[PDB]
Amino acid sequence: VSEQSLNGRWTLKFFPQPAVPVMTIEGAEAANGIVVDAVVPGNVEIDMEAAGLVEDPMVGNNIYKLRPYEGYQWYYSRTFAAPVVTEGQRLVLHFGGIDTFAEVYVNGIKVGSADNMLIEHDYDITSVVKEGENRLDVIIRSSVMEAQNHFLGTLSIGNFSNEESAPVRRAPSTYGWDIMPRLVSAGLWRDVTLRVENPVTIVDANWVTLSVNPKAREASESLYLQTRLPFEMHDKVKAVITISRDGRQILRKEALMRKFANLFTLNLSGVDAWWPRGYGEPALYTAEVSLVDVTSGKIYDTKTSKIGFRTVKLELDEVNLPGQPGQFQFIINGEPVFAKGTNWVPLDALHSRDASHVEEAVQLMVEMNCNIVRCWGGNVYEDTHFFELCDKYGIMVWQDFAMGCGNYSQRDNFAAALEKEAISVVVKLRNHPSLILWSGNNEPNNDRVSRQVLSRVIYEFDPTRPYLPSSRGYYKDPFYTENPSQFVSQIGYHGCPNRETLERMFSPDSVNPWQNGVVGMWNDEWQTKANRIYDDKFQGGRNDLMTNQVRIIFGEVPADLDDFIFASQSVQAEAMKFFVELWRGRRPYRTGIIWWNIRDGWPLLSDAISDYWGGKKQAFYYMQNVHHDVCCLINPAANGYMLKVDNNTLKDFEGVVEVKDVASGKQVFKGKFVSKANQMSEIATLPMQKGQGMLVISYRIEGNEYFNHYLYGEPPYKLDQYRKWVKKCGIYEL
Amino acid sequence: SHMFVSEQSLNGRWTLKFFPQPAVPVMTIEGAEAANGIVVDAVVPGNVEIDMEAAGLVEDPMVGNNIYKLRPYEGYQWYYSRTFAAPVVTEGQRLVLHFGGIDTFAEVYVNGIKVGSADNMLIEHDYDITSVVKEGENRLDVIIRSSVMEAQNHFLGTLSIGNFSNEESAPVRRAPSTYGWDIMPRLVSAGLWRDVTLRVENPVTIVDANWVTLSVNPKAREASESLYLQTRLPFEMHDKVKAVITISRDGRQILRKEALMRKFANLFTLNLSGVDAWWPRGYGEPALYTAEVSLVDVTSGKIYDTKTSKIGFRTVKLELDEVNLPGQPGQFQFIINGEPVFAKGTNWVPLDALHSRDASHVEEAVQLMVEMNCNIVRCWGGNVYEDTHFFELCDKYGIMVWQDFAMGCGNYSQRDNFAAALEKEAISVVVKLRNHPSLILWSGNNPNNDRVSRQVLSRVIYEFDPTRPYLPSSPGYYKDPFYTENPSQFVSQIGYHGCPNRETLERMFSPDSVNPWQNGVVGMWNDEWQTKANRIYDDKFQGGRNDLMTNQVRIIFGEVPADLDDFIFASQSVQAEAMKFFVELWRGRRPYRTGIIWWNIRDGWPLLSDAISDYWGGKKQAFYYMQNVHHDVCCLINPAANGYMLKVDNNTLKDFEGVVEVKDVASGKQVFKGKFVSKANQMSEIATLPMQKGQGMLVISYRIEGNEYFNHYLYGEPPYKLDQYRKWVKKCGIYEL
């Protein structure tokens, strides 16, 4: 009926938390602290940096300066004008995100308490609001100190996930990880609105695709409609269901409301199925349900969403390692699909800025041609707009519940707070066709959280998607080339980011990685930029992976910064391309490959192919030519090489292919291949070449020339000769 | 027979005030009297529509489309009010207000003090009103709220939305049928539907007396009974009260045991001799023994409490089958007292949509199963758990009972709040009924991840009734392979439609609607005939469930008659032949088949249904056909691949001899005659009969121990001439028009 936004400029008052959390407006106002101007949605640090109280945490060795504020309390306060409500209307205050532990007041009357950061919090403030100006106050307390209110188990201590994160329901990466800083932060990081609800309102509209037939263009969509219906409005309200696409109506059904909950089955015709990238087009149809009066025609409530007709099933392998992880394949609309995609790490430590990055970051997966994406359980749950873009661009979604690496409490209190979070996120996202699977991310089979709690929520609230109770040297080491997992989550390879980002994330005297000139030893800022979480001065650790991989492939490690960037990005590009080629090259058995990762969430040194500021590394372009729907590649063989072609679509393709040595120009093979649909077809057994070099391949499919290469030989290689081969190949630059 | 020192009844004339429920429901006496409502005279035990039909507030729902008129009352509140005289209580005594039934959500008040809040209509509710009652006149107030609006205080799951069970029935603990089914009308109703009494308990009182049969030897007349007695015993009365156990039958005392109460809970192991076992119908006698336990002072001899009940020495065991379909429901057999019994009985659907009238129907409805000779009955989980008197009659006539927990066909919640309500309900009904020898099995109906069926209800049976099995899963042409090739050994035979007797049609339908065909066109039904096929909600359509009546008479008799009397004979004969064929098919396919539970012997409302008897006791033609195929020893004929097959079935533990004569009723030509030896508790094939020509009927006349019994078998293939089938029936002489 009405949704007045409460986003804007608020009043933030922060002060160190005493031994007893204030938890009262009086206490908060009486506390001696600093008052600055805030912005909702926003994270406290942003409101302080705009006021000049803190320095930029994204520049080198400044993330640590935000340490004392992890034990501070925050006091958001504003005034709003309440809307006039008629008899029977509700007035709901909606918070999209409170980080995290906070008490909510309306006109000095507590209307609720917040204990989660990943889900929404709604409060009925109808009987507490006055006419005219009303006051709204929330009192956030230290999340780190809330952990000491619980007794951890032996399993919950010592894991990479910080022990302060085990008893609380916040994103584990905020407490620190290999790929993101320790910036716990706090605040209203999402929208804050006011809603008016008529006595006849729609509580939930759950769209479920029973069946779908791509041929003959048929589908069967069900609507699980739950409504709040006063008994005098029974038999007097009718539900109006409308399926449309680009204004054109496809189906319209009306039925009289005779009970609060109903199941309306719709057998549609002339509709297209929703397919992931390559295997078809993302067909979306606007589905709208309305509760209107049969007499006056008044529209009491209307809910609208873009749905898609898709059936998902997880076929488990029962021959090759029947119980081991990875022995599964996704079946979409009866067709077994091959999954190639990235892992979705946080878009920002200050998660209030995630909404601004979701548009450009999803476009990274579009150019990358990813048909899947796994939202890592260390990040907050993305909002509905992320799933709307994944619906639009046909990128399937693998959602992990927000639980990091480690075991969690087995007691009733933790299981209750988790069930509340699970039911909230499931009902919110169970209508997006991109979403295909929920996961527990355990790595025995006794964790109640993974085999009783998160399972039971899916059993009752989402029976359409499957639930899984559980999830460094030479890239050709048998460790990689013999992993029996059909479906794999390949680890990343470290790569120095682009030079432009180095000069922005590091101070001018620390841009050079080698401190005092000695190659191999990293300065303090370069050590901090791998997170380090706490400022424990030391040498080595994670950054040594960058020089070890450069040493394995290119003999030594260069001293010049420009040459070292080319080295680290090349060993990352060839490694990732080799991993994707290997799994696509065994596609009859290999079922999918998700890799790590496509974009960072902070200016840090990492194993990603693109940084926070959009600086695409070389590994992005190498793998972009290996994610094409129809792609030719070369895999190592027992007695030579093997030229293959993989097809991740439902259509057959024909074309020619020409491979030849780039160092000399001698042609190795040229022929005509027939790439059958949804399979890998072997072209010919290319003969083993001699020494080292690179084989440039060029295949034409339906009047379009595509390119790819293959590095042959055994390391070490001369770096100036690899740059010579890449430039003469004429595919990638730098 | 729990001898409380005082039990004063509060049943009788009450004061009912009903009014539409506002946004926030009324829960206080202040708001109840202040609400603008309507006051009439009520009767307890009773339902609100019974009290409103009196004084002319509503027309008879049992007649024509008058039911849907009760719709606005589903959002009404109901305020029962009364005044009672408090009995005198000595120091240490307790005054308990007993409620046998409260449909459903309600707040109970005594002298303006809330003594209780209710949320279930299937379990009893007791409250201690010692510290709230005064002397003389006390006021009793009950404020019942709308059950339908309570469902909107819960969020249902995808599974709970869209089942044959109303979505409103899932979050609430009420009989699912009330919200409307296909065999019972929509009538949520409300009101105190069972007794309301005042009880005075002594400080020394019996909390529970649980009788358990550990072993039984029918030969030599031996048994081993256990008594799990829990009492309320003040510590100063320890070592001063003795328990007196008395097992007796027909006045003669079998066992008497005295023991000093040295603790509140005890177990008494009894090894009796000269006692008979309790058997179902056919397999023996329903031997019952009156069991009495008393708490009496060892010095003064004053009896503080006595609890008496009749029990039966019987052991039940469910034998599973891991050879043919290991794990599929229907592969089991009941073993009573070491013998595998064949179950032939009915499903038990509600006796009345206004369940306050159920108690008046149990006596006659049970008698229907006695003449029917049912050794088993399955109380459907849409009815309300019946009261002790129903199980007492099953104990008396040897009818085993299969009780299903009141759960709907659909899936339910898996959260803690619903499970807590269901555990309370399960413990209450189990402790109440765990002493009846008739009860043999509990079922939760309903993958296997359901907390309700595979945890909540199982845990209860585990701790409170480990003597009975618990099953966590339960369920055109009548010779179609859909019926004749059913994999289940223990089957729940789906019923066939049958037009009720003519006298019923004239009483339930208006005079202008007694004829079924509106506008005279055969095949189309008038609105009343559409509603009486149970159309929960008043949505006008054509056909639907009623079309099954004409489809069956069209397959069997070619064309549906245009005369009402001939249409009755058609629909009742296609049901009589179908259900007779289903029972003869399972009784003839033993020992693989283990039992058949047909649906249904009696309806709970004047409706057109698949039953063999209507709400007013009108036995349809199928009722008499089934009686000749439900005898202890029965001769029948089954279809074979290259002919027929004359068989005899025995559901007793005794052998029998006799002679059988099968002849063609039309020609009079004898097809077979000879002596047969029916061994006990098994099926014996007599001989293969040659394939008779054309259509007709074979009459079976077999005598056993100087008693002539009769049966028949209709051969040929449909369609048949209706007047020729009537000719064949009259020629047999077994049944009547």
- Sheet of A201-213, strands arranged across: A201-213, A218-228, A261-269
For B707, residues 6+ apart whose C-beta sits below 8 A from its C-beta are none
| Interface of chain B toward chain A, CB-CB under 8 angstroms | 20-21, 23, 71, 74-75, 146, 148-149, 151-152, 155-162, 166-168, 411, 413-415, 449, 451, 537, 539
- Check residue A558 and give left, alpha or beta (phi > 0: left; psi -120 to 50: alpha): beta
φ/ψ of residue B701, rounded to 5? -125, 105
- Asked whether A629 and A648 are in contact (CB, 8 A), the reply is yes
In which element (H, E) is residue A399 found? strand A396-400
CA angle A329-A334-A338, nearest 5°?
35
- Asked whether A588 and A338 are in contact (CB, 8 A), the reply is no
**Residue A451 DSSP class:** I
Diameter of chain A by CA atoms?
A: 87
- Check residue B44 and give left, alpha or beta (phi > 0: left; psi -120 to 50: alpha): beta
Burial class of residue B162 (count of CB atoms within 10 Å of its CB; 0-12, 13-18, 19+): buried
Structure tokens, A443:
């790595």
Q: Which residues of B touch A263 (CB under 8 A)?
A: 161-162
Cα–Cα distance between A640 and A688 in angstroms, integer? 4
- Asked whether B287 and B279 are in contact (CB, 8 A), the reply is yes
**Residue A452 DSSP class:** I
**Alpha-carbon A528 to chain mean position:** 25
Mapped to the 3 state alphabet, what secondary structure does B665-723 carry?
CCCCCEEEEEEEEECCCCEEEEECCCCCCCCEEEEEEEECCCCEEEEEEEECCCCCCHH
For B119, residues 6+ apart whose C-beta sits below 8 A from its C-beta are B104, B105, B172, B173, B421
Q: Which residues of A touch B151 (CB under 8 A)?
A: 260-261
Cα–Cα distance between A558 and A537 in angstroms, integer? 25
- Asked whether B513 and B64 are in contact (CB, 8 A), the reply is yes
Cα–Cα distance between B104 and B146 in angstroms, integer? 8
In which element (H, E) is residue B507 found? helix B502-508
Cα–Cα distance between B287 and B310 in angstroms, integer? 10
Question: Which residues, listed in sequence order, are joined to residue B637 by a DSSP beta bridge?
Answer: B646
- Best residue of A203, A209, A231 to probe chain B, by most B CBs closer than 10 Å: A231
Structure tokens, A36:
């600055």
What's the length of chain A?
A: 734
Q: Which residues of A touch B167 (CB under 8 A)?
A: 259-262
Structure tokens, B390:
């129903």
- Asked whether B344 and B374 are in contact (CB, 8 A), the reply is yes
Cα–Cα distance between B459 and B635 in angstroms, integer? 44
What is each CA distance from B605 to A303, B98, B407, B503, B545, in whole angstroms?
A: 41, 29, 21, 15, 16
Angle, helix A384-392 to helix A412-429, in steps of 10 degrees: 40
Q: Which residues of A touch B71 (CB under 8 A)?
A: 234-235
* Cβ contact A461–B158 (<8 Å): yes
Cα–Cα distance between B239 and A537 in angstroms, integer? 77
* Cβ contact A460–B158 (<8 Å): yes
- Best residue of B18, B152, B178 to probe chain A, by most A CBs closer than 10 Å: B152
φ/ψ of residue B418, rounded to 5? -70, -40
**How many CB atoms are located within 10 Å of the residue A212 CB?**
23
Among all chains, which residue has been given the structure tokens 């040594």?
A544
3 state SS of A216: helix
Closest-CA distance of chain B to residue A404, Å: 25
Cα–Cα distance between B611 and B616 in angstroms, integer? 12
Nearest to B722 by CA among B580, B620, B569, B572: B569
Torsion sign, CA atoms B529, B535, B538, B541 = negative
In which element (H, E) is residue B125 found? strand B125-128
What is each CA distance from A350 to A171, A389, B392, in whole angstroms?
A: 12, 22, 71
- Asked whether B361 and B351 are in contact (CB, 8 A), the reply is yes
For A410, residues 6+ apart whose C-beta sits below 8 A from its C-beta are A153, A447, A448, A449
Nearest to B334 by CA among B613, B559, B593, B538: B593
3 state SS of B372: helix
For B529, residues 6+ apart whose C-beta sits below 8 A from its C-beta are B509, B513, B516, B518, B546, B608
In which element (H, E) is residue A330 found? strand A328-332
Structure tokens, B239:
């070592």
Torsion sign, CA atoms B143, B148, B150, B152 = negative
Among all chains, which residue has been given the structure tokens 């201690």?
B128
Burial class of residue A717 (count of CB atoms within 10 Å of its CB; 0-12, 13-18, 19+): buried
Torsion sign, CA atoms A572, A576, A577, A582 = positive
Q: According to the entry, how was the structure determined? A: X-ray
Cα–Cα distance between A603 and B25 in angstroms, integer? 58
φ/ψ of residue B637, rounded to 5? -130, 130
- Sheet of A328-332, strands arranged across: A312-316, A328-332, A335-336
- Best residue of A85, A90, A226, A294 to probe chain B, by most B CBs closer than 10 Å: A226
Nearest to A245 by CA among A293, A309, A192, A329: A309
* Cβ contact A234–B75 (<8 Å): yes
Nearest to A345 by CA among A380, A389, A372, A369: A380
Cα–Cα distance between B460 and B468 in angstroms, integer? 12
End-to-end CA distance of chain B: 47
Mapped to the 3 state alphabet, what secondary structure does A75-134 carry?
EEEEEEECCCCCCCCEEEEEECCCECCEEEEECCEEEEEECCCCCCEEEECCCCCCCCEE
Q: Which residues of A touch B449 (CB under 8 A)?
A: 455-456, 459
In which element (H, E) is residue B214 found? strand B205-217
What is each CA distance from B351 to A661, B165, B178, B231, in whole angstroms?
A: 90, 19, 12, 36
In which element (H, E) is residue B502 found? helix B502-508
Beta strands in A638-732 (DSSP E): 640-647, 653-661, 667-675, 679-684, 693-701, 705-712
- Closest residue, chain B, to A229 (C-alpha): B152
| Interface of chain A toward chain B, CB-CB under 8 angstroms | 88, 199, 203-204, 206, 208, 222, 224, 226, 228-232, 234-235, 256, 258-263, 419, 455-456, 459-463
**Residue B64 DSSP class:** G
φ/ψ of residue B675, rounded to 5? -90, 145
Nearest to B399 by CA among B466, B344, B476: B344
Nearest to B700 by CA among B641, B654, B649: B649
- Sheet of A435-439, strands arranged across: A467-468, A435-439, A396-400, A372-375, A339-344, A592-595, A487-489
DSSP codes of every residue in B282-306: TSS-B--EEEEEEEEETTT--EEEE
- Asked whether A387 and A278 are in contact (CB, 8 A), the reply is no
For B109, residues 6+ apart whose C-beta sits below 8 A from its C-beta are B29, B115, B139, B140, B141, B142, B143
Cα–Cα distance between A476 and A582 in angstroms, integer? 10
Cα–Cα distance between A215 and A335 in angstroms, integer? 13
* Cβ contact A224–B161 (<8 Å): yes
DSSP codes of every residue in B431-488: HHHTT-TTEEEEE-------TIIIIIHHHHHHHH-TTS-EES-----TTSHHHHT---
For residue B331, how many C-alpha atoms fall within 13 Å in the half-sphere facing its CB? 11
**How many CB atoms are located within 10 Å of the residue A73 CB?**
26
State which amino acid sits at residue B54. Answer: A
DSSP codes of every residue in A589-627: T--EEEES-S--SSS---S-SB-TT--B-HHHHHHHTTS
- Asked whether A125 and A93 are in contact (CB, 8 A), the reply is yes
What is each CA distance from B530 to A235, A529, B607, in whole angstroms?
A: 20, 77, 10
- Asked whether B59 and B369 are in contact (CB, 8 A), the reply is no
**Residue A378 DSSP class:** T
Angle, helix B388-397 to helix B362-372, in steps of 10 degrees: 30
Asked if residue A716 has a cis previous peptide bond (ω within 30° of 0), the answer is yes
In which element (H, E) is residue B724 found? helix B722-732
Expressed in percent and rounded to 5, the helix, strand and coil fractions of chain B are 25, 35, 45
Structure tokens, A311:
């059936």
- Closest residue, chain A, to B159 (C-alpha): A460
**How many CB atoms are located within 10 Å of the residue B153 CB?**
9
**How many CB atoms are located within 10 Å of the residue B272 CB?**
16
Q: Which of B148, B162, B414 sits opposite A224 (nearest CB)?
A: B162
- Asked whether A602 and A181 are in contact (CB, 8 A), the reply is yes
Torsion sign, CA atoms A714, A720, A722, A724 = negative
Structure tokens, B572:
């009742």
For residue B219, how many C-alpha atoms fall within 13 Å in the half-sphere facing its CB? 3
- Rg (Cα) of chain A, in Å, rounded? 28
Q: Which of A203, A224, A230 sits opposite B158 (nearest CB)?
A: A224
3 state SS of A262: strand
- Rg (Cα) of chain B, in Å, rounded? 28
In this structure, the strands spanning A630-637 and A592-595 are unpaired
Structure tokens, A187:
């605040």
Please report the number of interchain residue pairs, chain A to chain B, with beta-carbon separation below 8 angstroms: 68
Diameter of chain B by CA atoms?
A: 87
Structure tokens, A381:
């749950």
DSSP codes of every residue in A178-214: SSS------B--S-EEEEEE-SSEEEEEEEEEEEEET
Cα–Cα distance between B678 and B694 in angstroms, integer? 31
Cα–Cα distance between A371 and A365 in angstroms, integer? 8
Burial class of residue B236 (count of CB atoms within 10 Å of its CB; 0-12, 13-18, 19+): exposed
In this structure, the strands spanning B439-443 and B470-471 are parallel
For B106, residues 6+ apart whose C-beta sits below 8 A from its C-beta are B117, B118, B142, B143, B144, B145
In this structure, the strands spanning A8-16 and A34-40 are antiparallel
Among all chains, which residue has been given the structure tokens 């991989």?
A549
Among all chains, which residue has been given the structure tokens 């589903």?
B74
Question: Which residues, listed in sequence order, are joined to residue B442 by a DSSP beta bridge?
Answer: B403, B470
Structure tokens, B248:
């007796």
3 state SS of B610: coil
φ/ψ of residue A75, rounded to 5? -125, 95
CA angle B417-B420-B426, nearest 5°?
140
Nearest to B600 by CA among B374, B423, B405: B374
Cα–Cα distance between A733 and B285 in angstroms, integer? 97
**Residue A449 DSSP class:** I
Beta strands in B129-203 (DSSP E): 137-144, 196-201
